[PDB]
Each structure stands twice: as C-alpha cells, then as structure tokens.
C-alpha cells in the first residue's frame, strides 16, 4: 500500500480535500489507505469511502456505456468494418472498471463487513457489496454472469433483511438500499414488477413514518423518497 506510511487521520483529511477539489480518484486512494489501517470506519468515513468510489466507478460506467453503444453500432448490418479498436478500448475501460469493483469488494471482504456489527454500518457495507457486484453484472457476458448477479442479489437481500428488522422505514440507508435493490431488479434481474413493487412499498411505508421525524430528518428522508418516486415515474 502506497498509503501505508501516511497517518489514518491525514488520509481522512486528504480524502476531504480531494472531495473539495473533485479529485475522486485521489479521494478513493486515500480512503482505501484509511480502510487498510484496519480500524472500523465512522459514519462520516463510510460516506467518504462510498462517495469516492461511486464517483470513480460512475465515470467508468458512463464511459463504458458510450463505448458499448459505439461498438453495438459497428456490429449492425451496413456498418463499415473499422478493426478491433472499439472492442479493445471498451475492453480496456471494462477491465479498469472491473478492477475498481474488485478493489472495493476486497475492502468490504477484508475486513469491513465482518467487523460491522451495528445495523447502520453492516447494512451500508452490504448495500455497497450489492452495488459493486451490480456494476460487475452490468458488463458481464460470460460463464460467471449468473453467479455475479446472484452475488449482488444475496448482498442486497442480507442488507434488506437487517434493515427491515433494525431500522425505521424512513432511515436514509434503508431507503437508499431499497432504491438500489429496486434498480437491481429492474435493470439486472429482468424483474420490473419486483422493482416497482419494492419502490412503491418502500415509498409508502416511509410516507407513513415521516410524522415521527424532525425537520432535518424529514428533509433527509424525503430527498431519497423523491428518487423512489422518480424511478416509479420512469417505470410506470
């Protein structure tokens, strides 16, 4: 680890600076270094980790989609053969994406998940595990595709089970998990009815619990609820 010589606190400070500077690759490396110190992460620190890698892989996913579209077009009838370059470069970006996913999954497996005992931390990491297996599923075309999908599903399902037992229906992590698992159903598992059902039930149960919240918690919860509504609007 290139970050092995840097203090945990300095890695966290620098991750924050990197976020301010919109340097998400640096942010992700700092946060990897912090995780590898071996201590559990606070809430703020888990958020830094997630934001960093979400931004890095988000950029790779967007790039992969642009390239995959160009590649598809090149493989339609009446398209002029332009050699292996589009496939090669889509593969390059794909491999880099896969590497990032593998890195995040490796952090989760060694050893964030196993040390996470509180519902809020355990659900957050299991949601991440689901997300990064979903990103691997997005680009999978091989022998392992079904197993990758199932890995995403299993991680999301464990998170869902804990969240429903341990968190209120308005809890932002419970909402965010549901939002993402619902997307997994729609986009990855070919289960749009499950996606819709989950988004709707999650929204409605949250609605009914808003009355219990402070103004600030209300703001947090309603923000993610609107994302559930946005997807339902997209899908219905």
């Amino acid at each position: 680890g290139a970050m092995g010589s840097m203090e945990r606190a300095s890695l966290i400070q620098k991750a924050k600076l990197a976020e301010q500077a919109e340097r998400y690759e640096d942010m992700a490396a700092f946060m990897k270094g912090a995780v590898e110190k071996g201590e559990e992460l606070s809430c703020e620190e888990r958020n830094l980790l997630s934001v960093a890698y979400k931004n890095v892989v988000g950029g790779q996913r967007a790039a992969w989609r642009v390239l995959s579209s160009i590649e598809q077009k090149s493989n339609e009838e009446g398209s002029e053969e332009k050699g292996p370059e589009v496939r090669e470069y889509r593969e390059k970006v794909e491999t880099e994406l896969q590497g990032v996913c593998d890195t995040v999954l490796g952090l989760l497996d060694s050893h964030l998940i196993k040390e996470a005992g509180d519902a809020e931390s355990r659900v957050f990491y299991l949601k991440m595990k689901g997300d990064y297996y979903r990103y691997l599923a997005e680009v999978a075309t091989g022998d392992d595709k079904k197993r990758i999908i199932d890995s995403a599903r299993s991680a999301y399902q464990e998170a869902m089970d804990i969240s429903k037992k341990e968190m209120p229906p308005t809890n932002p992590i419970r909402l965010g998990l549901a939002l993402n698992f619902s997307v997994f159903h729609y986009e990855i598992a070919n289960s749009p009815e499950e996606a819709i059902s989950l988004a709707k039930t999650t929204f409605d149960e949250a609605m009914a619990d808003l009355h219990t919240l402070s103004e600030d918690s209300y703001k947090d919860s309603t923000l993610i609820m609107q994302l559930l509504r946005d997807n339902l609007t997209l899908w219905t």
């Binding site: 993402n180 997307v183 946005d230």
Partner: peptide, 5 residues
C-alpha cells in the same frame, strides 16, 4: 438511467 445512491 434510473436513480441510485
């Protein structure tokens, strides 16, 4: 694409 967080 749909919203995720």
């Amino acid at each position: 694409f749909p919203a995720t967080v």
